Design a protein around this nucleic acid. Structure first.
Lengths: 335, 134, 59, 421, 225, 116
RNA sequence: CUGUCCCUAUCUA
RNA sequence: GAAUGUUACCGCAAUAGUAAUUGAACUUAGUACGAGAGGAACAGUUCAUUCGGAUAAUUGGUUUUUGCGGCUGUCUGAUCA
């Protein structure tokens, strides 16, 4: 067993809030420290191994990498945290005066019966001659010692049927807390690209709730996995995302017939080797190593050779419908 | 001695008490596994060998000279499916092994039958006496 | 490894070149070549036995 | 072993050995009991502790006996060498003392264990155990002198040379103070200065050298003029199969006259006559004719202050001991200069490039820019090798343009006939 | 004349590398001291190619060839073949061989004029070896030893047979090849002469453990000096 | 990387997928899925299964031999890897794939025409 | 020769 | 699971527990040491045994998919089923 993981009780919520954030270099440029996403099945990857010393140097190796759907994240507010003897305290919060229907639904448990008066009063007062928002911004700039940004996922841009977004706070690691809120102000109602927070070969640590198992209570507990390298970052509009520099085949990373228990990838996604806690359709948050863990394995780049995108349901001998048609040829139902 | 690298955790399917054909012209017919050197002692686990592993075995069949004696043996065939680094899973025709001194020098002048790539790359002397590598 | 000329199977059961005129004649029969040499890969032995019997009857 | 007994375990003195044994007994075994405990339980506990103490003593004594080599049961050369340094009878008596102590300890432990089981009370059992421990301590205590002697001889034997009489060898003999070790310095790796006083070398020195690829080594001796230092040389000369070289000083050095040296050599002749002797001279020279009366001895007139004849003597000693379609070579290889390791301007090997780049575990050899190509512009090979699930390597070939043109011609000849409709 | 080295604290010099009169092959590893030694002994005089065979570091045993051509087993990947072609001049032929005896280095002992092969090798492979390498091929076994390549080293200047070679077998081999042959040992009495060292018309590399008399015998039999 | 052809089914075998078997003859049997491996274990004849590509080729249900299939010859002689050669080979492969599709469609139409 | 076991996993009422 | 106006969202942390473990492959090493015999180590990298948390991307196992196809037997007068 492992007494450190006890109690093995149910998680507080599906969204496992991040307990700790990486170091805060107050001189670096403002940037986000975490990103949201949804697990989308898994796939096999074969690539060369540029790793001196290892016997498999200059050799191809088969590996399994998970695929997480990461639609562009949109910022809706910021949180200012002051330092107190009883720990960090949130003194105030602000909003963008405009909230997508997803977050508005997130604030209601019975949406269709609700009057949808989520933020009408606050928005009306926001449209005054200031003095209500600038006051809070100045208060945060003065007293707050650390600033966190509130964002939500674009569920309506996801093939899932949840139709509800999840609020999450992300710490800002870069410039002084005044520069932090100044940068946040320019990003209210804006969207942050997935490739801006992470890049290829970068190591990340995932945090999510694992698959539940019911009475044995087992599963459905929060877990953290560290030292996961990013193999490739793609975009929904970037056709042939599964086309490596070698494969160069105009095929998307989405498996033939769609993912198992999941839809199709038509948005930005992050590819990282190994598995991640949780299952498909589970919301996952991504952190970056919590520290300078830049080992040789992290430092070395991973030049992808081929990406598996065959039919994950059952088995598969072809990666695209064109290959199946060419190999099988014409059929009775074709003509 | 004999080894040329660090062990790779391939699938294990040859626990203690197993019998495998002696794939060499040393005259031995089969080798009986009594222990697996270098293995970990788990609770109630039977030490399990694999391709490229050095284990101690006794010649249960063959000429009387080799009978009743114990000498180190190197596994050349496992017959159990295992994951090679080159994607596809493979398994050999049947279990087989060779007898050699702890220094890796084979007792037989030449090995017969297919030889696992992992064992050949880990035991240079075995590859020297091998004629069919995979 | 075991390798034997199945062409000489006429003179043989324990097991289970077109230059020679005998094999050319035996090939003219409606039988046969597709999988005769694939013994290890092959109940098909019955067809091989029937072909051997036919060859013996012819010769 | 037989070469150098450096592996003998340290012989802890009586006080140290007893302390170690008692500490082991007190630590490993339990020591908590009560009068209310079962009588059989207390008896078993005390018996187990006594047996553990006895077993520890027996193990220590057995290890000491086994590690130490039995002088009588060793090679005669090594036997006599040890006898000269350590009196053989005294060493045997010391070993017998340890054996007797071990036997007494075993007998005491057995007798007390037999008696201990009958203890009717906790106090009686404790008294019996204390008596057994006192007996063991007294047996160990009496061994203080033999234990100290064993420790001293162990600490001295480890540094002894690993002489190999069976191997062909040469022995440097002669009078003391004749610079006999100077020849050793200039013929082997040994290091002993002239030290103009005679008895610099209180122990034999050995040095290795190779001639005609055959292994050889030289043994130095203090010299002869009835003492341990001189006595050990006699057995080395006799038992060893090595040839013996006699050193003589043809000068005022060492004070001994040439006549005295010649007379001494003749007097000791009956002992090394069969060793294929040689004489090196480090009216005066007329007496050398008498020395030459022995057919097997030469006269190497020399002076050990330099290498005037050491080079020739090295080969002479070894000789005396032994007496007892056409190929294709590319012009590039013949023209390329040899890689001079000491020259800083030598061609930089992969080792230098790796060192300039980093450690062996971080620098990766790049095969690009090394292999030849039609054009070096695209040296960064990025060969896809896959196209729509098809193996390009199965299609890569030159002059495929003609095949494609033929296929196009076939397509044209088939389309005009209306094959497809 | 000859050189004594060790690869990754190993004495099987010939197992991890192959040497010819016009090219050399070495394994891949972080510690390139083997490559550094090869460059010191040969440098830019002849190409030095890093190439693995089916991912194995025993390329010296998996592949066999001469100055006129090189042979690789079926298990060799197409990428490895392409790299070999790029790194090797067109004057040396490269031809993949499909045979049961994949251990070409252990099954085929070949020099620039004559080669020995395992008798069980099929006729097609023997013909391919004769054509591509342009050398005579004869089925033979050194004193009953089946693995001629591992237990025999051949070169235009001479050849070294395993110590247990019968005198009659030595004379027969010398007559077949016409070059002098003398029984000997390498790696301080190692019976695998063809694995512990490599030799060409002008260069010989042996294990560091090789004794000085063994080095002298190797030089004399090959007429280095 | 190599997209091997299954010994039994003749279908492509991408890396990782399928299983392999080693025979004493040094040949390797590649199976795209557990179905083919189990069928081979029972020693069933591939030429007697209605769904095996070998049976279809022998049965004549598909074009057994065509000019476009000669380009896929296993070439054991490597090439100097000229970029112009690479581009020409890629274009030729695409055109040959299109021509093979057209010829297969024509063959199917010829085999189908007549069902009056 | 067998899931007694290495080492447990799965289905049914 | 009521409770502190009600309802919902995002949060800090006093507190209780805690975890990783040991080995081996190579430059350094045939270097210091050493007559020889043998033969270190730091810094660096690469792997491994046991233990623990997860996943099914490939493979092994499992079928009231009963999903398909066949087989011994009988019934719907039989065949289709």
């Amino acid at each position: 067993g492992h007494l450190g993981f006890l109690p093995r009780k149910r998680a507080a919520s599906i969204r496992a809030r991040v307990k700790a954030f990486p170091k805060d270099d107050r001189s670096k440029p403002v940037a986000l420290t975490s990103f949201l996403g949804y697990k989308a099945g898994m796939t096999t990857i074969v690539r060369d191994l540029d790793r001196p010393g290892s016997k498999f140097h200059k050799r191809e190796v088969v590996e399994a990498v998970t695929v997480v759907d990461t639609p562009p994240v949109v910022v809706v507010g910021v949180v200012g945290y002051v330092e107190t003897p009883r720990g960090l305290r949130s003194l105030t919060t602000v909003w963008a005066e405009h909230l997508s229907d997803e977050v508005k639904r997130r604030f209601y448990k019975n949406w269709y019966k609700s009057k949808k008066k989520a933020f009408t009063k606050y928005s009306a007062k926001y449209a005054q001659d200031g003095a209500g928002i600038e006051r809070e911004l100045a208060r945060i700039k003065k007293y707050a010692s650390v600033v966190r940004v509130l964002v939500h996922t674009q569920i309506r841009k996801t093939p899932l049927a949840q139709k509800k977004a999840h609020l999450a706070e992300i710490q800002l690691n870069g410039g002084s807390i005044s520069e932090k809120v100044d940068w946040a102000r320019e990003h209210f109602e804006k969207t942050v690209a997935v490739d801006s927070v992470f890049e290829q070969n970068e190591m990340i640590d995932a945090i999510a709730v694992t698959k539940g198992h019911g009475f044995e209570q087992r599963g459905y507990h929060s877990r953290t996995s560290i030292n996961h390298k990013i193999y490739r970052v793609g975009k929904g509009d970037d056709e042939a995302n599964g086309a490596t520099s070698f494969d160069r085949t105009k095929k998307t990373i989405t498996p033939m017939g769609g993912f198992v228990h999941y839809g199709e990838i038509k948005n930005d996604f992050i590819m990282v080797k190994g598995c991640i806690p949780g299952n498909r359709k589970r919301i996952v948050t991504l952190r970056k190593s919590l520290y300078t863990n830049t080992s040789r394995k992290a430092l070395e780049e991973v030049s992808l050779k081929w990406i598996d995108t065959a039919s994950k349901f059952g088995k598969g001998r072809f990666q695209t419908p064109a290959e199946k048609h060419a190999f099988m040829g014409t059929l009775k139902k074709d003509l | 001695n004999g080894a040329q690298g660090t062990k790779f955790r391939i699938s294990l399917g040859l626990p203690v008490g197993a019998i495998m054909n002696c794939a060499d012209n040393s005259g031995a017919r089969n080798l009986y596994i009594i222990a697996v050197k270098g293995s970990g002692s788990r609770l109630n686990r039977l030490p399990a060998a694999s391709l490229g592993d050095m284990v101690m075995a006794t010649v249960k069949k063959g000429k009387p000279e080799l009978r009743k004696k114990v000498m180190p043996a190197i596994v050349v065939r496992q017959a159990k499916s295992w994951r090679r680094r080159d994607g596809v899973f493979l398994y050999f025709e049947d279990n087989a092994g060779v007898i050699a001194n702890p220094k890796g020098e084979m007792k037989g002048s030449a090995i017969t039958g297919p030889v696992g790539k992992e064992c050949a790359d880990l035991w240079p002397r075995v590859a020297s006496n091998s004629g069919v590598v995979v | 490894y075991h390798e034997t000329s199945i062409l000489d199977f006429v003179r043989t059961i324990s097991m289970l070149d077109e230059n020679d005129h005998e094999w050319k004649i035996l090939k003219k029969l409606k039988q046969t070549r597709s999988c005769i040499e694939d013994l290890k890969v092959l109940k098909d032995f019955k067809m091989i036995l029937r072909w051997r019997k036919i060859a013996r009857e012819i010769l | 072993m037989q070469l150098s007994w450096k592996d003998i375990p340290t012989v802890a003195p009586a006080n140290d050995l007893l302390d170690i044994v008692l500490n082991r007994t007190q630590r490993k075994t339990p020591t908590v009991i009560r009068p209310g405990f079962k009588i059989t339980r207390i008896r078993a506990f005390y018996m187990r502790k006594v047996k553990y103490t006895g077993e520890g003593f027996v193990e220590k004594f057995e290890d000491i006996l086994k590690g130490f080599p039995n002088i009588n049961d060793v090679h005669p050369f090594h036997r006599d060498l040890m006898d000269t340094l350590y009196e053989k009878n005294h060493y045997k008596i010391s070993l017998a003392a340890i054996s007797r102590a071990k036997s007494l300890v075993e007998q005491v432990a057995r007798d007390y264990v037999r008696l201990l089981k009958f203890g009717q009370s906790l106090f009686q059992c404790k008294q019996l155990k204390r008596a057994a421990l006192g007996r063991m301590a007294t047996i160990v205590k009496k061994l203080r002198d033999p234990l100290a002697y064993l420790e001293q001889v162990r600490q001295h034997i480890g540094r002894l040379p690993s002489i190999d009489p069976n191997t062909r060898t040469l022995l440097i003999c002669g009078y003391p103070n004749v610079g006999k070790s100077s020849f050793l310095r200039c013929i082997t790796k040994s290091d002993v200065d002239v030290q103009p006083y005679a008895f610099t070398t209180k122990s034999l020195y050995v040095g290795h050298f190779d001639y005609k690829y055959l292994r050889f080594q030289a043994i130095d001796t203090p010299g002869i003029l009835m003492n341990n230092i001189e006595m050990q040389s006699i057995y080395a000369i006799a038992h060893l199969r090595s040839c013996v070289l006699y050193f003589m000083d043809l000068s005022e050095q060492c004070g001994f006259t040439i006549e005295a040296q010649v007379k001494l050599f003749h007097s000791i002749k009956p002992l090394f006559a069969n060793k294929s002797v040689m004489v090196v001279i480090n009216e005066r020279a007329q007496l050398l004719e008498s020395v030459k009366e022995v057919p097997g001895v030469e006269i190497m007139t020399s002076s050990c202050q330099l290498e005037e004849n050491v080079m020739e003597v090295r080969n002479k000693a070894c000789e005396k001991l032994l007496a007892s379609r056409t190929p294709f070579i590319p012009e590039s290889v013949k023209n390329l200069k040899k890689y001079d390791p000491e020259d800083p301007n030598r061609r930089k090997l992969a080792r230098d490039i790796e060192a300039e780049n980093g450690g062996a575990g971080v620098f990766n050899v790049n095969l690009k820019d090394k292999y030849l190509l039609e054009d070096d512009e695209w040296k960064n090979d990025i060969m896809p090798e896959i196209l729509d699930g098809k193996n390009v390597y199965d299609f890569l070939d030159p002059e495929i343009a003609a095949k494609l043109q033929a296929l196009e011609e076939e397509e044209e000849k088939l389309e005009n006939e209306g094959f497809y409709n | 004349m000859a050189t004594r080295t060790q690869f990754e604290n190993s004495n099987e010099i010939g197992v991890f590398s192959k040497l010819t009169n016009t090219y050399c092959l070495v394994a891949v590893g972080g510690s390139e001291n083997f490559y550094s030694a090869f460059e010191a002994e040969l440098g830019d005089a002849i190409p030095i190619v890093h190439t693995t065979i089916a991912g194995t570091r025993i390329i010296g045993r998996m592949t066999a060839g001469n100055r006129r051509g090189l042979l690789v087993p079926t298990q060799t990947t197409d990428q490895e073949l392409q790299h070999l072609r790029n790194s090797l001049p067109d004057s040396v032929k490269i031809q993949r061989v499909e045979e049961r005896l994949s251990a070409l280095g252990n099954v085929i002992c070949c020099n620039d004029y004559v080669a020995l092969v395992h008798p069980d090798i099929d006729r097609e492979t023997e013909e391919l070896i004769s054509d591509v390498l342009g050398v005579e091929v004869f089925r033979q076994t050194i004193s009953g030893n089946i693995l001629v390549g591992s237990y025999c080293s051949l070169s235009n200047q001479g050849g070294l047979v395993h110590p247990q070679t019968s005198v009659q077998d030595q004379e027969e081999l010398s007559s077949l090849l016409q070059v002098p042959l003398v029984a000997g040992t390498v790696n301080r009495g190692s019976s695998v002469v063809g694995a512990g060292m490599v030799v060409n018309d002008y260069l010989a590399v042996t294990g560091l453990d090789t004794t000085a008399p063994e080095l002298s015998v190797i030089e004399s039999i090959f007429r280095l000096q | 990387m190599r997209i091997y052809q299954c010994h039994f089914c003749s279908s492509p075998c991408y890396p990782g997928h399928g299983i392999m078997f080693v025979r004493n003859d040094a040949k390797e049997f590649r199976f795209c899925r557990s179905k083919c491996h189990k069928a081979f274990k029972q020693r069933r004849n591939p030429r007697k299964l209605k769904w095996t590509k070998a049976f279809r080729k022998a049965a004549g249900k598909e074009l057994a031999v065509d000019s476009t299939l000669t380009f896929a010859q296993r070439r054991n002689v490597p090439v100097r890897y000229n970029r112009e050669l690479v581009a020409t080979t890629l274009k030729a492969m695409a055109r040959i794939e299109e021509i093979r599709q057209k010829r297969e469609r024509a063959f199917y139409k010829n085999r189908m025409r007549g069902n009056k």
